[model samples]
Target: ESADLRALAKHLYDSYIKSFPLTKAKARAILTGKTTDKSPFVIYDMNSLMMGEDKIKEVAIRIFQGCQFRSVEAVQEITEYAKSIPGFVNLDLNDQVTLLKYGVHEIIYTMLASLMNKDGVLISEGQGFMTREFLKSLKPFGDFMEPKFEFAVKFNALELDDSDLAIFIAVIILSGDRPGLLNVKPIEDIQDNLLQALELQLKLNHPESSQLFAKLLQKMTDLRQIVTEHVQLLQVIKKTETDMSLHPLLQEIYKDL
Candidate 1:
């Protein structure tokens, strides 16, 4: 059982490597808001995007537009990544959608750790760090972002590198208990193997930390809590913040979450 699961871990690592090509150097440069000829994409800061307007309408619109843009691209990339996981594409297509819909936000937040620290998060593709204090000044939006900083800062404390993240995120996406899953047995089977793969991966990657595996599982629960609060906040925005709009794809993803 351990050997087969370890083999599955190998597959997950391969998929992860192929799926995300944004290496540390690339992400690092992007986060600085400096555009080299080799920069993957352009990232803009809230002030840069809003041009110091600082009004509620401008603040909501620019901030959301950038976030939606990132989420849309992320969702598409995640879909491609999902298809590569062993046995993932064999499930009913609807189940695939269900898993992606529920898990995308958590996956996004997990990846966000790489682009963040205890002080702030890289926004607009690394245009620059949006300080937590500035985010807290955005009124209704502050409530949504505070928990995000909390999650990201704490997640960074784990110090999981790419290989560790590879297995961990796969575990997040294939979680069997996600509501509306149609084919539960196969999904659960895949998840069990993924959990083993993750446990083995943590041991290999972070040999010094005996409790890393347990802590990551706890982080997953914390991630779920963040997503729940996020959805509630999005609902309020949808009802009240008419100036802000969500990407259609993000709207679809959040609609089901």
Candidate 2:
């Protein structure tokens, strides 16, 4: 039924609309009819990288700042999404953050790709879109981005609608099972329930195939694998780019990663 498919998506949009008007602050269109926060994408001049070390450094810092900003927003959005789920708020704060840190990056890229105007994603506050070809052109800076583009490419092939994405993102967040969770059983119970809800939603949304559910699950599995590579990229960025400082929360997540 449309009701089954729309239940979670309704929450995702209503949560955003109540907190932020749809007229403004649409952080990538995942939650609202309007646009999402247009996260910037900077491209530094190639010649400057060789002689103007400071220019390269400035570009690096700004890139990091944009990433850091979007990354924090992704985590925050996940946290808020969970709170809207029944009994999710009752979980310990530590468990909430733990689930978020492990999975936020994966979802962050997912949202970015979801905003696609075809194969490319918006960059520089929607001023431009980035194609996979441009990503390859990034060379050394682009190498770390390879996995993200890979996942987005395959995921876009799936052609999930907005309602499907809302439930899918929730499944990823609740499915996390990091150590030291105090109420594991209940949270696990919630995750299970969510999985079923998603299954029913998918069945209703895509009446064509019984295989779609497993296909989406496989995509989430790939999402986690890509995330493992993303962590490595973060380490490389934090280590080699001394001029760029990461957010404190990002630093904490890095330690666990």
Candidate 3:
């Protein structure tokens, strides 16, 4: 692995660790060749690499560099730009809903990918049975495998499930502000709708499958809180408009917020 990539991966892992200790420990163990517990939610093939912290850093940096650069500098750029938009500054009820929806989707997708990748490494190293079982449970909905499956199944036969994919798609659709994407209803009503979908899936299939669906819902809820917090932090920094006065750690985050 490239030395620079290793450095960058270390930086990314460090940032992740500081911000989320529990998650970081899980991530680091996988990266450093330590643990191997399987769960369906692990990110893509993360365990195969022989890289140390430095190598991990290199990989992470390269991935970031590979992305297309639009006007937005990083994730933070999205938050700042969204808040600065003429009609969005005041954020009317509709605007707030739109922001929340997109923010929720972005959070879920990013975190899910990250977590899965981090966990996948551990699974690859001889702790993947749980994930295989989880994926097996999801097969009835349809094929939901990610492009990274070749890497994953190199050692074990883990596949994505349609229900999980559906949940992810639901999140993306909800994020869009386009009309008719979602019926404007009370929060409870929306939650109920989601629950109803899960209930139907449960009744139509194995009762044991409901557990994974429940976990997915919980994950989505956790994602909402994280996105809200991160967006709010970005908004505060944007409002100040001066990057110099922010804490060093926050300044680093501002670059990618």
Candidate 4:
């Protein structure tokens, strides 16, 4: 009965592995693996105190650079995923760009869950842990990372595994509601199937979790507000900080965000 759902799910999962360097399964093994020492494995920790204002600013810039670098990768990944959707590439090319431009941030935040916990997100493919407290110390810069933590906390409560996230992230990218889209009907059709796929996925995987389907839809709305705040903060960064330069692709996306 779920012929469409089955095919879509397959594409979504393959695209997901293509999109992320560290899938949730791999990260879990690293975090929970038995260690030679009784103490937990020590990932590169970004929370260590920066000695001076100069050091703090330097490290802050490095974080920003890391963010920009990741955004470029994220956008490319999303594009590949979008292309896998049936009829996605058939949308007017400009509309395709509009959807990716608007949707990439939300997708990135959702994917961050694979690399994050309440404390902070792992970075550089689990080579390091960037603590929430250290991020808060950066004032205006940490401002962006902090709200993301808040969103990630609530979203993580859903406890989605990688398969669940694969369909959900596809749903995020295919939403027909983005402004300036030229081919709304087909996009909507694709989104409708994606929603069905996600709902069925939840029912099969989390039968005990009541109304999780609805709750995830609500999170999509929350992601909208988060993306809005991200753009506003990005504007502030662009205006005030000359030391950091955004990746050109990120600049193109933000130029209109």
Q: Each candidate's lDDT (Cα)? A: 0.75, 0.62, 0.36, 0.78
TM per candidate comes to 0.84, 0.76, 0.33, 0.88
| Candidate 1 global CA lDDT score | 0.75
Writing each residue's lDDT as its tens digit, candidate 4 over 83-128 gives: 8777778888998898898889899888886667777676666655
lDDT by residue for model 3 over 1-257, one digit each (tens)? 24433343333333333432224235344444564623323322334223322322343322222221211223343344234222334434654555543553343333334334412322322233113223322321111223223233321122223332333333333333334333444433433443455445434444545455555545544444444554564455346444223334333433442
| Error at 155, model 1, angstroms | 1.2
Query: What is the Å distance of residue 226 in model 3 from its true position?
Result: 4.5
Choose the strongest candidate by lDDT: 4
Off by over 4 Å in 2: 1-13, 16-61, 116-119
- Model 1 alpha-carbon miss at residue 106, Å: 0.9
Clashing pairs in 2: 26-35, 26-36, 27-36, 27-37, 28-36
Candidate 3: misplaced stretches above 4 Å?
Answer: 1-62, 65-160, 168-191, 210-213, 225-257
RMSD of 2: 5.8
Better of 2 and 4 by TM-score: 4
The TM-score between candidate 2 and the true structure equals 0.76
